[PDB]
Amino acid sequence: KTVVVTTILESPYVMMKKNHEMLEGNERYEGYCVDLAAEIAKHCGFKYKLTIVGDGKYGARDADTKIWNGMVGELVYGKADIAIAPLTITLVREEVIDFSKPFMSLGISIMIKKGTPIESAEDLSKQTEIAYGTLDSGSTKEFFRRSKIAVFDKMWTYMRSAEPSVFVRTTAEGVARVRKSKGKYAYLLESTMNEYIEQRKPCDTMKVGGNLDCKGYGIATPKGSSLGNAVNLAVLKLNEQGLLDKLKNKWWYDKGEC
Numbered sequence: 526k527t528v529v530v531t532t533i534l535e536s537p538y539v540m541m542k543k544n545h546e547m548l549e550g551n552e553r554y555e556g557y558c559v560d561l562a563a564e565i566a567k568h569c570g571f572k573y574k575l576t577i578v579g580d581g582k583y584g585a586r587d588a589d590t591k592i593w594n595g596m597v598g599e600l601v602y603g604k605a606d607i608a609i610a611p612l613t614i615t616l617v618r619e620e621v622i623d624f625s626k627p628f629m630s631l632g633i634s635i636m637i638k639k640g641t642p643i644e645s646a647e648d649l650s651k652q653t654e655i656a657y658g659t660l661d662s663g664s665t666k667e668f669f670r671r672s673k674i675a676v677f678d679k680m681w682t683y684m685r686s687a688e689p690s691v692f693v694r695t696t697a698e699g700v701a702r703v704r705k706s707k708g709k710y711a712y713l714l715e716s717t718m719n720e721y722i723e724q725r726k727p728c729d730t731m732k733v734g735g736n737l738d739c740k741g742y743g744i745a746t747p748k749g750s751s752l753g754n755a756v757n758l759a760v761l762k763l764n765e766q767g768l769l770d771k772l773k774n775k776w777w778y779d780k781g782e783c
């Protein structure tokens with residue numbers, strides 16, 4: 526009867542508490558999604574075990590083998606009951622799993638080292654001296670692969686064959702790469718994560734341009750699962766109560782450094 530919660534380490538959604546060497550199970554982690562977890566549980570009614578996805582990925586279906594990896598996979602292949610993390614709600618995913626009403630909104634955005642000669646996605650697509658990429662197995666990559674919009678199509682045609690690879694394994698790798706590339710690498714990632722990093726020392730990154738799209742994160746559960754209707758109801762209620770906004774103040778604004 527214990528629901529197993531699959532999630533991923535992504536600041537400030539899920540972070541290792543500073544004294545993680547000890548404290549067991551769910552007491553080891555902290556962050557927005559951890560708090561959201563508890564709330565959903567207390568409101569929906571049930572206990573849960575927080576588990577960090579093995580492959581540390583969000584979720585992509587290998588075109589060749591039609592096999593889903595990451596959190597989406599662990600949901601489609603009975604390895605987890607519910608996914609509570611910043612998992613983007615998308616068309617292709619809504620065909621093999623179920624999402625609640627979004628609990629937070631976001632859009633793809635651009636992160637550059639301060640002083641980089643880039644002010645927009647169009648700027649990036651009209652030059653080549655500055656490389657750029659996204660997270661390897663997430664929705665941002667797939668957004669570009671699929672885009673029909675001229676600019677993003679052009680950006681994708683560049684990214685897929687870019688050498689060396691512009692794709693990263695984690696958000697931290699993308700960010701690091703932006704910081705250690707002397708203004709020669711731009712990173713495309715979701716605004717939520719982009720804005721968090723922007724308010725954290727060394728305060729050398731920046732967000733330029735507007736969001737490239739509008740999307741939402743949602744609690745995910747297996748097709749026709751048992752919690753489906755409940756969680757959506759819990760989410761709508763927390764949204765109603767205004768508790769999701771408060772969690773946002775807690776983890777984003779009340780912790781700026783620049």
Ligand SMILES: N[C@@H](CCC(=O)O)C(=O)O
Pocket residue numbers: 583584611612613614659660662663664665666713714715
């Ligand atoms: N939120 C994305 C991961 C981050 C990204 O793709 O930029 C997903 O659920 O795949």
